């Protein structure tokens, strides 16, 4: 099928994994999990669940930054997340963030903007890199849109 | 503001899926300096920026994001997603080839709706429009 008798339609696809060194890349495993990877050895997981991992409602940030034992990129991403729109735990270098959806409307709006709901919580945690992208290909557009 | 990064741009086998070497003319890529509603130029700018950043040196992209891309294009695509209009997943593009001479057209986004790519007949009109533009160009010179 050639258009106008001289032109033919052709297609191409783009690979965003060569951008792994500079831009964070996001992808959705399934409808309940989302993964944003920084570099090639560390990322961040966004989980919609009906389980509780932290009971207290405290959230301290000054002590976490003062200890200066964490990953700069991960803190930057969680900060640009929770200012664009909450139990917290960062002892031992961990990153555990709990959102008590069941405030919720804006958090889910940002979640849908990145990942572009009968779930009680939303948990943000730290993981290592694994081949997780199944439903969507990795692309930096979610974080680029969330930045501005 | 407006994007400021500047660029026969040629795409290597590490930037594509199931392709070896696809690349375009200077006339086609010259449009990337004077168009505001095209993704392909934004992706080209991101590619170029990553290339220079790695061969010359994440805060760099934090302070350099607005000099490369157009955020309102992302916002428009998000709005068309909310209101159930075909939008861009930001991966697939289509273009015309003209095998007899080799001159091509600047790639345009392949729309997505209901979790699947649109059929070629669902936007075929645009294709003829592009063909028309090309013929006028080859009738201009």
């Amino acid at each position: 099928s050639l258009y106008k008798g001289v032109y033919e339609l052709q297609t191409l696809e783009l690979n965003m994994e060569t951008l792994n060194m500079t831009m964070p890349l996001s992808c959705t495993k399934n409808n309940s999990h989302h993964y944003i990877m920084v570099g090639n050895e560390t990322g961040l997981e966004l989980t919609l669940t009906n389980t509780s991992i932290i009971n207290h409602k405290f959230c301290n940030l000054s002590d976490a930054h003062k200890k200066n034992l964490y990953d700069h990129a991960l803190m930057s991403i969680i900060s640009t997340f929770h200012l664009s729109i909450m139990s917290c735990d960062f002892n031992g270098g961990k990153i555990s963030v709990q959102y008590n959806l069941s405030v919720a409307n804006g958090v889910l709006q940002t979640f849908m903007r990145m990942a572009w709901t009968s779930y009680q919580y939303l948990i943000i945690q730290n993981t290592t890199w694994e081949d997780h992208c199944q439903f969507s290909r990795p692309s930096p557009i979610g974080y680029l849109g969330l930045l501005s | 503001g407006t994007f400021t990064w500047t660029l026969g741009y040629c795409l290597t086998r590490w930037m594509l899926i199931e392709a070896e070497l696809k690349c375009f003319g200077n006339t086609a890529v010259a449009k990337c300096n004077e168009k505001h509603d095209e993704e392909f130029c934004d992706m080209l700018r991101l590619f170029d920026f990553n290339k220079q950043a790695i061969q010359r040196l994440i805060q760099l992209i934090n302070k350099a994001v607005n000099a490369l891309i157009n955020d309102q294009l992302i916002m428009k695509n998000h709005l068309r997603d909310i209101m159930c209009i075909p939008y861009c997943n930001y991966s697939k593009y289509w273009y015309l080839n003209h095998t007899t001479t080799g001159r091509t057209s600047l790639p345009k986004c392949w729309l997505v709706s209901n979790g699947s790519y649109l059929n070629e007949t669902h936007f075929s009109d645009d294709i003829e429009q592009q063909a028309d533009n090309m013929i006028t160009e080859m009738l201009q010179k």
Partner: antibody
Amino acid sequence: QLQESGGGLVKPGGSLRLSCTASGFNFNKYNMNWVRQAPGKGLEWVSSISALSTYIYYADSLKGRFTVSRDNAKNSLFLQMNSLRDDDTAVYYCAREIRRASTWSADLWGRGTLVTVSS
Amino acid sequence: IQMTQSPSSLSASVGDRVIITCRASQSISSSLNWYQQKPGKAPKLLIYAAVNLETGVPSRFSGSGFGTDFTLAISNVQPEDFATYYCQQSDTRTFGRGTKLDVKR
């Protein structure tokens, strides 16, 4: 380095276990796989396992007999075989896998251990 | 997907150019790794991504090809370059038959 152990002589139909310990890199972040070589023939891939043991891939013909796992705390990689057959004598290598150019490639191989099954 | 390797055992002396071919039924894009193994020793990479080169490997090894065809080329074979060569697809993680290289007489 990657040091492997557990090889030796085992009767047919028995249960066997091999171990591969690593020292010199981050054991937590790397996919690791097991490869096999028969005496006088080509190479053969036994299995592959990811970092947090979430994606485990197995040989098409070896499925149902081989069980792989790892201990990230002790930097160890264990393989268990049950209902061994006579043609399961071979040399076993534990290889470290790395992802680059959108592709898996093994960049470090161990010394390899010999397993013999006979009556 | 099954790979076919040619030839089974080719013969060439020092200084000559040698070519080995790994061919696939389907199109595996650019996903192929080339290994070399010495008798009684663990193998080592020569080629990754079917065209690139592993660090610490001499520059006389050239990998090329696309789609259903791939080729390894050695220009000037040194005495320490007689071993068994394997082509491994990096998605299904399957090896090839193997090609052996021997001296000429």
